Amino acid sequence: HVSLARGEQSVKRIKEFDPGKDSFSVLLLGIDAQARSDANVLVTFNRKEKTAKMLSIPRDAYVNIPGHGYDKFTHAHAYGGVDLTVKTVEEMLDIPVDYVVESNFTAFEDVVNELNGVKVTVKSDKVIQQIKKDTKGKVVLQKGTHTLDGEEALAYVRTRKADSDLLRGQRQMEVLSAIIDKSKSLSSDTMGQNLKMNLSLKDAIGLFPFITSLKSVESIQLTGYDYEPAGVYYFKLNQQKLQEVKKELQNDLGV
Ligand SMILES: CC(=O)N[C@@H]1[C@H](O[C@H]2[C@H](O)[C@@H](NC(C)=O)[C@@H](OP(=O)(O)OP(=O)(O)OC/C=C(/C)CC/C=C(/C)CC/C=C(/C)CC/C=C(\C)CC/C=C(\C)CCC=C(C)C)O[C@@H]2CO)O[C@H](CO)[C@@H](O)[C@@H]1O
Ligand SMILES: [Cl-]
Ligand SMILES: [Mg+2]
Q: Which of 108, 109, 181 to mutate to test the pocket of ligand 1 (most atoms within 8 A of CB)?
A: 108
Q: Whose CA is nearest to atom 9 of ligand 1?
A: 134
Beta carbons within 8 Å of 43's beta carbon, 6+ residues apart: 25, 26, 27, 28, 52, 53, 54, 55, 176
Instruction: Map out the domains of the chain as residue ranges.
Output: 1-104+191-255, 105-190
* Level-2 CATH architecture, domain 105-190: 3-Layer(aba) Sandwich (3.40)
Q: In the β-sheet with 51-56, what is the strand arrangement from edge to edge?
A: 195-197, 99-103, 24-31, 37-46, 51-56, 216-221
- Given a contact cutoff of 8 angstroms between Cβ atoms, the answer to whether 127 and 159 are in contact is yes
Residue 157 Cα distances to 83, 127, 194, angstroms? 24, 11, 18
**Residue numbers after which the chain breaks, C to N beyond 2.5 angstroms:** 33, 188
β partners of residue 85: none
Backbone torsion region of residue 78, taken as left when φ is above 0, otherwise alpha when ψ lies between -120 and 50, otherwise beta:
alpha
d(CA 220, CA 4): 26
Count Cβ neighbours within 10 Å for each residue of 135-153 and write b for 16 or more, e otherwise.
beeebebeeeeeebebebb
Q: What is the DSSP string of 67-118?
A: TTEEEETTHHHHHHHHHHHHHHHHHHHTS---EEEEE-HHHHHHHHHHTT-E
CA 224 to chain centre: 19
* Level-2 CATH architecture, domain 1-104+191-255: 2-Layer Sandwich (3.30)
Q: What is the DSSP string of 13-80?
A: -SSPP-TTTS-EEEEEEEE-----EEEEEEEEEETTTTEEEEEE--TTBEEEETTTEEEETTHHHHHH
- Listed as own residue / partner, the contacts of 189-195 with beta carbons closer than 8 Å and 24 or more positions apart are 190/110, 191/107, 191/110, 191/111, 194/103, 194/104, 194/106, 194/107, 194/110, 195/101, 195/102, 195/103, 195/104, 195/107, 195/111
Pocket of ligand 1 (CB under 6 A): 26, 28-30, 32, 38-39, 41, 43, 101, 103-105, 107-108, 111, 134, 157-161, 168, 172, 175-176, 211
Beta carbons within 8 Å of 195's beta carbon, 6+ residues apart: 101, 102, 103, 104, 107, 111
Residue from 1, 152, 17 nearest 98 by CA: 17
d(CA 188, CA 198): 24
Phi, psi angles (nearest 5°) of residue 82: -65, -35
Q: Is 255 helix (H, G, I), strand (E, B) or coil?
A: coil
Ligand nearest the Cα atom of residue 105: 1
β partners of residue 30: 39, 103
Going from the Cα of 36 to the center of ligand 1, the distance in angstroms, rounded, reads: 8
Backbone torsion region of residue 193, taken as left when φ is above 0, otherwise alpha when ψ lies between -120 and 50, otherwise beta:
left
Amino acid at 89: V
d(CA 252, CA 220): 13
Q: Whose CA is nearest to atom 27 of ligand 1?
A: 158
173 CA: nearest ligand 1 atom: 39
| Burial zone of 193 (CB within 10 Å; 0-12 exposed, 13-18 middle, 19+ buried) | exposed
d(CA 179, CA 146): 14
d(CA 240, CA 33): 35
Residue 204 Cα distances to 54, 77, 107, 160, angstroms? 18, 24, 16, 32
174 CA: nearest ligand 1 atom: 39
Q: What is the DSSP secondary structure assignment for residue 4, as one 8-state letter?
A: P
| Burial zone of 232 (CB within 10 Å; 0-12 exposed, 13-18 middle, 19+ buried) | exposed
